[PDB]
C-alpha cells in the first residue's frame, strides 16, 4: 500500500514488495521517505498544457513524432520488432533528469538483460527499476506498475523531469484481470485508466513523461486493449514487422504512428518541413508499391524517377544506429537535405 521514495533509490532494483532486491549503481545519496502506491491524479487546474519538446535524440521520433514533457505515448509492437532497443535508445538518447522503469514482465532473463543494460549505462546514476517477473502473483505484477509511477511522482513534485516507462500495459492488463477474477463502485479493472493518467507536467512541479508499450498479436494487429490505451494517450509509435524484416532500424512506420501534441511543441518551420517530409514519405510507398507491380520504368515518368531517387537518402535518414544520438538541430539539418 506504501512504498520507499526518494534521490537513494537512484541506481536501485526494486521489487513487488518495494523493496531493494539488486543494484546497477550507487550513489552518495541515501534519502528514503515512504509514499502511498495509489494516489489520485492531478486536478485539471494542477496541470500545465504540454508546451516543451520532451527530445529524444532519434530522428524519426524528433522530427516527425514530437514529443512533450508531461505526454503519456504508447508504442506498439509485436514480439520481434525492437521495443526492448527502443526503449534502451528512449533513455539513452533523451536528456530526463530521471528514468523510472517498470517491468511487468515474463523471466527474470528479460529483467537481467535491463539490469545489465542499466548496468553499463551513461544513465545509470539517474535511473531506477521496478521489476516483477512470471513468477510473481498477479498482485504483485500490477503493484510493480504503481509502484514505479510512485517512485516518478516523487521526483516529479521535487521539480525533476521525469521519464517513466511501463513495459508492459499488456501484461499489467492481464494480471488486472486476474486480480479482477480474484474479486469476482469500484471495478479492477478501472486500475488502467487511472494509472495512465497520473503522467503529465505540474504547474508546481515537475513532470513525468511517460512511455507504455503495448504488444500486437499475431501480426501486428490491434487488440481491444491495445484500441482502448490508443485512445486514452496522447499518441502512439508503431514498431512494424514489415520495417523490422527489411533490416529497418528504428522499425518505426511514421505514416502510422502521431504524437498528438506535435504542434503544440514545434515551431512553424519545423511543421513545414515535417509536412513535406511526410509527403515525400507517402509519394514513396505509392511507387513501392507500383514497382512491387512491375509498373516502375526509367525515364518513363520524371516525377517517379525523382522519388525513386530519393528513396536512399529517406532510408538514411530514418535509420539509427542504436549507440547514437542526435540534437534536434542535427535532426532538423538532416531532414531538411533530405527534403531537398
Known sequence: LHTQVGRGLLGAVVNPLGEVTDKFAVTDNSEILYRPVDNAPPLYSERAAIEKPFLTGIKVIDSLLTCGEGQRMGIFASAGCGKTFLMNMLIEHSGADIYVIGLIGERGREVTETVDY??????????????????????????????????????????????????????????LRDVALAAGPVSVFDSLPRLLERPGKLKAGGSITAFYTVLLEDDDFADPLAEEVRSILDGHIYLSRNLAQKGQFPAIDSLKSISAVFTQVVDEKHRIMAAAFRELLSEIEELRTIIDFGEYKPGENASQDKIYNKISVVESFLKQDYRLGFTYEQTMELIGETIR
Open 118 to 175: 542499466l548496468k553499463n549505462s551513461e544513465k545509470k546514476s539517474r535511473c531506477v527499476l521496478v521489476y516483477a517477473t512470471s513468477d510473481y502473483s498477479s498482485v504483485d505484477r500490477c503493484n510493480a506498475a504503481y509502484i514505479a509511477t510512485a517512485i516518478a511522482e516523487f521526483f516529479r513534485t521535487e521539480g525533476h523531469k521525469v521519464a517513466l516507462f511501463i513495459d508492459s500495459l499488456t501484461r499489467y492488463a492481464r494480471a
